[model samples]
Target chain A: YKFGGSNVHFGAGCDSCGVYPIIGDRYRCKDCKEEIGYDLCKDCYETPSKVPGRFNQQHTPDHRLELA
Target chain B: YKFGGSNVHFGAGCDSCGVYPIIGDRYRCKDCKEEIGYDLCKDCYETPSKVPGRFNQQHTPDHRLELA
Candidate 1:
């Protein structure tokens, strides 16, 4: 990778926990269309939640998620 | 903090070392006008460098830098 170790989605926050600079593995919502994208921290992705995305994404548990 | 415990500029990389997801304190260039903005990690900012910005910013040591 051109960058250093670890994966970070800069400027993104967990939709469930609202943790910024999601350190370690990050989960991204496939269904959301925002440029910043709908993302989550590891804990939030594993547990799942009904929390609305911080960026106004209509995220739902039904929405598909993938590691970003 | 609304986000988390640390400061992170999401989607941003250090202009000097090219480290992505600047995890701790971040320095931003005030002169560079790019949408992504010109930023650097703590080490890079303190040491300063001739390294070109990863995002096409015409950054120079003379450019004003501030904590982001």
Candidate 2:
């Protein structure tokens, strides 16, 4: 249940819409209403490639992976 | 044993389908199915927000950070 000396649980709580986990992943919490994940949300998830106003949320498939 | 490299093995055997590893943490290997990490699964874990879907499967993102 623990890794890296710190409990490393890569669960749903952390990986929000791929907009707020690691540097390359993050999300905006309508809860806090604040763009979370400083790095991911700042760049790839909500910004233009080279420009600065074409903000778009990260890509998360509308469906979830269900094991059955 | 490596970083930014596939050698960053998070663990258990990965079949030939998924070409990835340790994106901050890991899980979901229908043993072979993809659609992993796109979002935090529809359900939560034994804790919260972790749906049972991610309960028996997915990468543990385990192993030691071993930075000594």
Candidate 3:
């Protein structure tokens, strides 16, 4: 997990589509409107869509986003 | 390692530029003219330039590219 001096983990998957794995940038909810552990894959999370999906208010723009 | 029943990595730096980490559509060398470990970041690898730079032939047009 230490490719460099920093900790790195290139082995993860998206929680929404479940198709694309986490490669570059990942987005997770610091505070979810539903579950506390709610997360999203890059595609679903970075979508230009103005509405949220993957459950009610899951990817809502109001939610705070954190990197994984 | 079990994020999506597949292997995914996002926490690694680019081998060429060393700035951008491995993300979506990472390019590596399946075969390197200088060394076997030759690699490049998206910007360096995907550059339209026909000449290689890192160490000459590191990103040459003749080299085979692989995904990270």
Candidate 4:
């Protein structure tokens, strides 16, 4: 929440492809420290069936992302 | 629910005094009509323990209010 600007209504959608990342290719979760609004897109972050699959995400595999 | 302009995010609050009828004094429920967005405020619509009570409203007692 409020990880800087333009998340268009804050974390607006796409926890994993529910789509609508304020205008596309979103990503967030700099280490899932207890779900502070996790997100991911860009085809679920470089689809390898979703980088370290956890589709609806409990975000894993060295978490650390951020793009918005 | 688009009851008209200036609901400050249509039907904004006040299902029964949650208070935020865009600018106050809300009321709605032409007849409950299967709960098409019920609302009520203005001191819970002329408070008498809420005129024919039903706090979170399933609106009865010949429902018919308007104002917003």
Please, what are the lDDT tens digits per residue for candidate 1 over residues B1-68?
11432366555678788887677888777777665567789988789668667757677777888875
TM-score leader:
1
Which residue runs does candidate 2 get wrong by more than 4 Å? Answer: A1-44, A50-68, B10-28, B31-68
TM-score of 2: 0.20
lDDT by residue for model 4 (B4-67), tens: 2232323245555455433444666666544335656666677644343333445565677777
Tens digits of per-residue lDDT for model 1 on A5-68? Answer: 2355545578777777677787777777655567778887788455668767777778888875
Among all windows of 10 consecutive residues in model 2 chain A, the one with the lowest summed lDDT is: A1-10
TM-score of every candidate? 0.48, 0.20, 0.34, 0.23
Question: What order do candidates take by lDDT, descending?
Answer: 1, 3, 4, 2
Task: Return the TM-score for candidate 4, rounded to 2 decimals.
Answer: 0.23
Q: lDDT tens string, model 3, B1-68?
A: 12321122344445556653445455656655443245556666676553454344445567677664
Please write out the lDDT profile of model 2 over residues A1-68, one tens digit for every residue. Answer: 11221122122122323422233233323222123211223344453332111123242333122111
Q: List the residue pairs that clash in candidate 3.
A: A10-B8, A10-B9, A10-B10, A11-B8, A11-B9
lDDT-wise, the better of 1 and 2 is 1
Candidate 1 clash total? 3
lDDT of 2 by residue, B1-68 (tens): 01222223332222222323333333332221233322121112113332323323343333111210
Runs of candidate 1 with Cα error greater than 4 angstroms are A1-68
The 0-to-1 C-alpha lDDT of every candidate, in the order given, reads: 0.68, 0.26, 0.50, 0.49
For candidate 3, write residues A1-68 as lDDT tens digits. Answer: 11421122244435566543455566666656453234566667767455454345355567787774
Question: Candidate 4 clashing pairs?
Answer: none
On lDDT, the candidate that comes out on top is 1
- Tell me the TM-score of chain B in each candidate: 0.81, 0.19, 0.48, 0.25
